[PDB]
Design a protein around this ligand. Sequence first.
Ligand SMILES: N[C@@H](CCC[C@@H]([NH3+])C(=O)O)C(=O)O
Length: 258
Amino acid sequence: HLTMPYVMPGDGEVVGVGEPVAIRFDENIADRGAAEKAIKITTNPPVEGAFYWLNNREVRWRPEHFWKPGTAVDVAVNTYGVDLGEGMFGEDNVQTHFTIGDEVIATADDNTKILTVRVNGEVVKSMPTSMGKDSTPTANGIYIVGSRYKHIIMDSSTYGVPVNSPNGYRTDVDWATQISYSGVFVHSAPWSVGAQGHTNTSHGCLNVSPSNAQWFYDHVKRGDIVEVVNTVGGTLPGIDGLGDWNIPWDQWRAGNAK
Ligand SMILES: N[C@@H](CCC[C@@H]([NH3+])C(=O)O)C(=O)O
């Protein structure tokens, strides 16, 4: 009958300007209002934010706009002695302190097929890219940078698409930076270097050159932003896991505690 909370980012991490506070619980939360009341967030410099639930075990908190660089954030999840709904009580209290780094926003514009990385507003890299072809397009919107892998296999069956089917794949890639839980990454794609900057050929990922992918891996960090614009796709879902910023502020602020 006890629930354990887990908070991210990790204690002492430096994260980008898009990183939300995330609190996950190992059990479904019956009284979201009680959970929100138990979570205290302090920021310096102080900024307004609000809670929004991504599913039955995970709540997020962010400001209306991306964090200012240098912001220090303290999170206190005080669920000991708190009835989180239906007599499920917090197993413990949990705290985290984190800081915001430089503002790094990389914009991939399907009109030019270039992914341009800006650091505190200045262009530092312009990479030709090949995004999702028209039958398997990359969604537009704001994506938060998640984990980074020097090598991994992306397998479409993770996402309910059989590897044997027309949009299926089981693909080894180097220098892969995850930007959605729906399976978009920026990664090395030596097989699409001809097409990069000209033609979209992927199932949704942002293919770039091996040197550009390794540069991205080396220089972009969790919470940095990639914004995709002008593709033939829809918009990344606000509840993706890394698509929080696609939910308009008025809806986020209003919340869904019920
Ligand atoms: N394999 C393609 C893109 C990955 C597919 C992914 N975005 C998805 O959500 O289906 C490529 O990298 O060339």
